[PDB]
Design a protein that fits this description.
part of a larger assembly, 1 chains, about 600 residues, mainly alpha, two-stranded antiparallel sheet, globular, viral protein/hydrolase, XBB.1.5.10
Length: about 600
């Protein structure tokens, strides 16, 4: 009757009871998302409160168990995830202050308004109408003024509560035997106590810096090409030695540049692939979309699953008979029950999101044999990365010709592939250095090393020199615009997106070099190749039971990370850029001032 058997039965009973509570809460949340009612709100609110009290009780009861007296890696890992501190040293006043700070900075930013001029009635909200006039607009002055008006009423109210949140989270990290809030955030990105595969939290910082200095010249070259296109798009607005304007990147912060594509068309004579009208003349629907996704997945090698799931997921427009959202979302409810939720329309992006959802749910049901605490990915970014690679790999026209989505009369040329790679760079590698500098600024902020009052131009100046974007108007100390974004306002990290990009690139390279494919890396197919399917499935079943380095090793063969997937995937586009826009000025200079 050693302590290991008591830990085993405690873990089992916690897994069962938490599985029941999680199943009830997820079921209530799902049927509330399909049918919005206040009684359902009370239902999963009571369920979530009871589950939170239960997890606190299980953690406190597991605090008795010695974490150094377990030799099995699985039981040690599950006790480590169960013996977390959370509120080990936390005053109740400090806890409610933290909660009120979180709620206030969420509610103020979420309910932000740009209603300065004219009558105070015509107020455009941030989500529906602001991004239209920041991204799909022509007036430089309107974009500048709207961005300034958005930052002005947000930064001053968002700065000191965010700084107090930084201070209190630093105090909690110190009280929880950690360095800082980033160190608590780097704890998941840490492989220690494992022989052979050893990783440090600062090794993640080193990897971030290494990947950024590896991707610096290609990003400089694409910035040069974008500025060269903007010279023709905007006559006499951007100096050649100057950097890009802040509001010219589509988004207010500069997240995605897919909106900045009509000005950056390489060739109007090359048609991209399009099966949406081919879908229309084929007259396919939501169930046909799901059947095509399943056909693609069994072409990869993943087996079919439950027939009661398809009727359990409502896919078309819910209508006004019951209030329901239209965001495509997955539901891993627990013990053998999954749902998807969207309103399906006839768009190609609906097919992309459906493939993304099926990749998510396939990875969900992969680790069903693992316990409820281990019923996740290796870390947070892995799930989004593995959804994204199934999302992108479905846009291969040879698959569409094999399944009849694309007619065989259409053909793929070099220039169309170059345009597709340029769009992919606008989506994938365009957001990579922005995610890098956001992650770096957030890490210096949450580490509590840089002064709070040194931010007169600091975020401005390494926006100018690190990514080559200059603000059009200076801002004072009360502004916290890099801290004013959606993810920082609700404390959603950005290391997850960087690691997702890295993992999806390495996984894409591994599957393209593994599934008997030779040639250009953006012409990568995985149909009629089950070796890649079983190589994936070897890592699908692992779940959270193993360190992430072991998960990468068992599916790639390497123990580290390299940017060679990015070079392999973007090599034709890199060569086309190198003989296209090398003649213009390449890079950026920080000497330009407003």
């Amino acid at each position: 009757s050693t302590i290991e058997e008591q830990a085993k039965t405690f873990l089992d009973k916690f897994n069962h009871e938490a599985e029941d509570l999680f199943y009830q809460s997820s079921l209530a949340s799902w049927n509330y998302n399909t049918n919005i009612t206040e009684e359902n709100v009370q239902n999963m609110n009571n369920a979530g409160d009871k589950w939170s009290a239960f997890l606190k009780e299980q953690s406190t009861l597991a605090q008795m168990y010695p974490l150094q007296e377990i030799q099995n890696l699985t039981v040690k890992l599950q006790l480590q995830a169960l013996q977390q501190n959370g509120s080990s040293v936390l005053s109740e006043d400090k806890s409610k202050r933290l909660n009120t700070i979180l709620n206030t900075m969420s509610t103020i930013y979420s309910t932000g308004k740009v209603c300065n001029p004219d009558n105070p009635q015509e107020c455009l909200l941030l989500e529906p109408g602001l991004n239209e006039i920041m991204a799909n607009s022509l007036d430089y002055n309107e974009r500048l003024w709207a961005w300034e008006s958005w930052r002005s009423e947000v930064g001053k109210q968002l700065r000191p509560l965010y700084e107090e949140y930084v201070v209190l989270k630093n105090e909690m990290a110190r009280a929880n035997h950690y360095e800082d809030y980033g160190d608590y955030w780097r704890g998941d990105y840490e492989v220690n106590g494992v022989d052979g595969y050893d990783y440090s939290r600062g090794q993640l910082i080193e990897d971030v810096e290494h990947t950024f200095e590896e991707i610096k010249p290609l990003y400089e070259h694409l910035h040069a090409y974008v500025r060269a296109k903007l010279m023709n798009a905007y006559p006499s607005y951007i100096s050649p030695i100057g950097c890009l304007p802040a509001h010219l990147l589509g988004d207010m912060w500069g997240r995605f540049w897919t909106n900045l594509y009509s000005l950056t068309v390489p060739f109007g004579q090359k048609p991209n692939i399009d099966v949406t009208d081919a879908m229309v003349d084929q007259a396919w629907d939501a169930q046909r979309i799901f059947k095509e996704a399943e056909k693609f997945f069994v072409s990869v090698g993943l087996p079919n699953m439950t027939q009661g799931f398809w009727e359990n997921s409502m896919l078309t427009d819910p209508g006004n008979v019951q209030k329901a959202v239209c965001h495509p979302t997955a539901w891993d409810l627990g013990k053998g029950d999954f749902r998807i939720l969207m309103c399906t329309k006839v768009t190609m992006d609906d097919f992309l999101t459906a493939h993304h959802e099926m990749g998510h749910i396939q990875y969900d049901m992969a680790y069903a044999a693992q316990p409820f605490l281990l019923r996740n990915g290796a870390n947070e970014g892995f799930h989004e990365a593995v959804g994204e690679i199934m999302s992108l790999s479905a846009a291969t026209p040879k698959h569409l010709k094999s399944i009849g989505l694309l007619s065989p009369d259409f053909q793929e040329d070099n220039e169309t592939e170059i345009n597709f790679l340029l769009k992919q760079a606008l989506t994938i590698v365009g957001t990579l250095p922005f995610t890098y500098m956001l992650e770096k600024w957030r890490w210096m902020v949450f580490k509590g090393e840089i002064p709070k009052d040194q931010w007169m131009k600091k975020w401005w100046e390494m926006k100018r020199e690190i990514v080559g974007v200059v603000e059009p108007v200076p801002h004072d100390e009360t502004y916290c615009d890099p801290a004013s974004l959606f993810h920082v306002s609700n404390d959603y990290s950005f290391i997850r997106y960087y690691t997702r990009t890295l993992y999806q690139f390495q996984f894409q390279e591994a599957l393209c070099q593994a599934a008997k494919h030779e040639g250009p890396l953006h012409k990568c197919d995985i149909s009629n190749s089950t070796e890649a399917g079983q190589k994936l499935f070897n890592m699908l079943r692992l779940g959270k039971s193993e360190p992430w380095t072991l998960a990468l090793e068992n599916v790639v063969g390497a123990k580290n990370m390299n940017v060679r997937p990015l070079l392999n995937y973007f090599e034709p586009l890199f060569t086309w850029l190198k003989d296209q826009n090398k003649n213009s000025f390449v890079g950026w200079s920080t000497d330009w001032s407003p």
